[PDB]
Design a protein around this ligand. Sequence first.
Ligand SMILES: Cc1cn([C@H]2C[C@H](OP(=O)(O)O)[C@@H](COP(=O)(O)O)O2)c(=O)[nH]c1=O
Ligand SMILES: [Ca+2]
Length: 129
Amino acid sequence: LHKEPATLIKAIDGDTVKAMYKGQPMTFRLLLVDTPEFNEKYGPEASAFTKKMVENAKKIEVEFDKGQRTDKYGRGLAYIYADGKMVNEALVRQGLAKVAYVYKGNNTHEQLLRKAEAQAKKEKLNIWS
Ligand SMILES: Cc1cn([C@H]2C[C@H](OP(=O)(O)O)[C@@H](COP(=O)(O)O)O2)c(=O)[nH]c1=O
Ligand SMILES: [Ca+2]
């Protein structure tokens, strides 16, 4: 996979971010994770985590997988990096997202994220507490 440029427009919630990509506004949904909704437990905390990460970065980048690049809602499906740190992995590692929606052909980082989730579960963090 390859990282491509994007510019933050707005952090929406724990697993969706609006960003400009190839000069057009896109809503991106993070691959391989599921954060709680804002009105659910840890929802506000996931939203804040993702917001801080993307807002504080000097740059964000998007990385598409090998498969589908948009979902049925027209959201971009990507791994998002904030100053080179993956948001999808960071959320899982802090127990603010579960590994989820693992579709074959768009699952390059599945094992990386499963290892993060095991660590968050061992530490009883957040969703795992
Ligand atoms: C993460 C992801 C979600 N989706 C679709 C499946 C779910 O459809 P349904 O809306 O029918 O439940 C929805 C979950 O997104 P959210 O967790 O943002 O609600 O997004 C994909 O199709 N591919 C993906 O890789
Ligand atoms: Ca969600």
